[model samples]
Target chain A: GGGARSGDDVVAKYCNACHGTGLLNAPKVGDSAAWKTRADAKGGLDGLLAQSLSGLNAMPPKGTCADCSDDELKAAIGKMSGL
Target chain B: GGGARSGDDVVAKYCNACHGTGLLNAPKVGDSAAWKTRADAKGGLDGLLAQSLSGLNAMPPKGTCADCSDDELKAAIGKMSGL
Candidate 1:
């Protein structure tokens, strides 16, 4: 738990392009407005998860992240979504 | 959608053992019931994907596989779950 690399480092490599700029309406990092409403209504991180895998609006399956795990995304979404 | 890899191939490389033999109560492959309940509640493939990342119970973060992408997991879970 303590030895894993930084979450930001991982996200930057995998999720930044679109998530960083709200491109394609994707929730930006640390941008509460980008994800708060949806995460809140859907019961937080878990809720946002369903959308991620299925691709809500423009979110491609797994956001085009070929090697990312659900755990990795959920943890990151939970933190970034503030859920 | 055109040439995705086989689900079993991905599973064999990443999800067997823990899921193949019901290791630690993890639902075995092809057993709909184990995954049915959750998939039903969450509405299917996407739902299973989120939890996979979060790791329920003994399921480790990414199931100890740091290289698998989320899409790979969802497709396998979806096909195996019949969702």
Candidate 2:
């Protein structure tokens, strides 16, 4: 499906569910420490992405976006974390 | 600005320069270890992205994709990192 893939759009539609308000310990995008912590715990950015694709502690697989690609999830987190 | 935003598309168009060729230490797609280092060094995915948007050691801002959005760049990295 053709659509806009801006980081802001992905965050608004999917990531905002938890990141916007920090639901279930999901780090808010603006929180540098929180994002960094998770990234470290996961072994780095790719590790975090693996969790996003395969599911994590509180987040379900795909972070609730069935159509979202692994890269889309990465983009969303990147925006929230201010990377 | 309607176009295919799949992670692969973004990679093919903009990310291939370094990520695909390992030019200037850019982490190639599917290279988890390499991606991890860069992600961690930058303080996580967000930090990596910030460098991407603002330019880093050898990569220019937006990685030379003047029209690519933050999300598109993230997606490209995710694909390359095997996230």
By lDDT, the best candidate is 2
The Cα RMSD in angstroms, rounded to one decimal, for candidate 2 relative to the true structure is 17.8
Q: How many clashes show up in model 2?
A: 6
Candidate 2 regions exceeding 4 Å error are A1-4, B1-83
Clash totals in order? 7, 6
Model 2, B1-83: lDDT tens digits are 12338558877766776677775466777888878877788777677667777665335455546677777777776777755
Clashing residue pairs in candidate 2 (N, C-alpha, C atoms within 3 angstroms): A29-A80, A83-B46, A83-B47, A83-B49, A83-B50, B29-B80
Q: Which residue window of length 10 is worst by lDDT in model 1 chain A?
A: A1-10
lDDT of 2 at A16: 72
User: At residue B73, what lDDT does model 1 achieve?
Assistant: 69
Pairs with steric clashes in candidate 1? A66-B69, A67-B68, A67-B69, A68-B69, A70-B53, A71-B53, A71-B54
Candidate lDDT values, in order? 0.61, 0.66
Worst 10 residues of 1 chain B by lDDT: B1-10
